[PDB]
Amino acid sequence: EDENILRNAVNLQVLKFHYPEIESIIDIASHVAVYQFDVGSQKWLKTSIEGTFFLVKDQRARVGYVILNRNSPENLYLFINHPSNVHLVDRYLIHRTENQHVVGLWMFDPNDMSRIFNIVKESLLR
Amino acid sequence: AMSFHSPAASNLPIPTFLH
């Protein structure tokens, strides 16, 4: 347990370095791949973003997530603005930002997927 | 309102937007 504590303290500072508005880590999942829906072609594309997923909250307690990319300096930090914008479909978390902007997340471990989904919904529960 | 080593992008379900 103690090695994980230090690891989360280090991860949070890596996060704050790229994204100083991040206040804390809610939860984590390893080996997440990111896809984008090209509706100008009706095709999913796999992005170059794969790495550790961090569900985080703002200093204003807005909920979002970061994927620290294991391939490049280009990470991804997105907000989850409305809980109904996130759907568990098949093996994927589908995240729709209003006006037809859709990303999809694949978590290596199926248990991370349904756990993170619940934590996302409960984090926004009001 | 919609409806419908890492996997190939072709495996993801297709979102459909309604009007």
Q: At how many Å resolution was this determined?
A: 2.0
User: Alpha carbon of A38 to those of A41, A43, A86, A120: distances in Å?
Assistant: 5, 5, 18, 25
Domains and CATH numbers, chain A: 1-126 (2.30.29.30)
- Nearest-Cα distance to chain B for A123, in Å, is 23
8 A C-beta contact, residue A97 and residue B12: no
Interface residues of chain A, partner chain B, Cβ below 8 Å: 33, 35, 37, 39, 42-46, 50, 87, 89-92, 94, 96, 100, 102, 104, 106, 108
User: Alpha carbon of A57 to those of A5, A94, A104: distances in Å?
Assistant: 18, 19, 20
Burial status of residue A71 (CB atoms within 10 A of its CB: 0-12, 13-18, 19 or more): exposed
